[PDB]
Amino acid sequence: MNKIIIYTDGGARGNPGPAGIGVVITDEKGNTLHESSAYIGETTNNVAEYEALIRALEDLQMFGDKLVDMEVEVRMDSELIVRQMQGVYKVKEPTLKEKFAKIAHIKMERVPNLVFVHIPREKNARADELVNEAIDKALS
Numbered sequence: 001m002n003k004i005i006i007y008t009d010g011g012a013r014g015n016p017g018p019a020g021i022g023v024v025i026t027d028e029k030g031n032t033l034h035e036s037s038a039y040i041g042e043t044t045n046n047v048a049e050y051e052a053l054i055r056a057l058e059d060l061q062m063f064g065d066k067l068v069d070m071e072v073e074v075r076m077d078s079e080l081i082v083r084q085m086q087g088v089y090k091v092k093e094p095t096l097k098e099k100f101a102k103i104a105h106i107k108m109e110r111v112p113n114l115v116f117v118h119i120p121r122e123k124n125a126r127a128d129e130l131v132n133e134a135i136d137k138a139l140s
Helices: 045-067 079-086 094-110 121-139
Strands: 003-012 017-026 032-043 071-076 115-118
Touching: 003 032, 003 045, 003 121, 017 045, 017 121, 032 045, 032 121, 045 071, 045 079, 045 094, 045 121, 071 079, 071 121, 079 115
Parallel strands: 003 071, 071 115
Antiparallel strands: 003 017, 017 032
16 A cells, blocks of 8 residues: 555444444555454443544554555544544543543554544445444344
């Protein structure tokens, strides 16, 4: 690849309730490099979104040597979370502050040139499907 493009989503059925994460990773041509779909136990929606980012950052380690000097972009359909991750707006929700700090440190350590991009919800349908696949399968 010449770029790694990541889409993430997380959701919960309830507040809190059964929750899932979805990560899609492509190259610059749009071809799939990886998908993650996982049940994460019972949490809130916003925690699930943050957990999906943490999982994407973990997935990235599996590229190993290929990660060096590689351009990485994370696309999310939550403008709020993108602005939070960019440091444009401060996180207020107390339940997110520890994960926010953890993500910031991981991203600096593993991928300090990572960029975040806000996309429309329609453009994030695959990651959403992965969330719901994981939750459905856990409940079934």
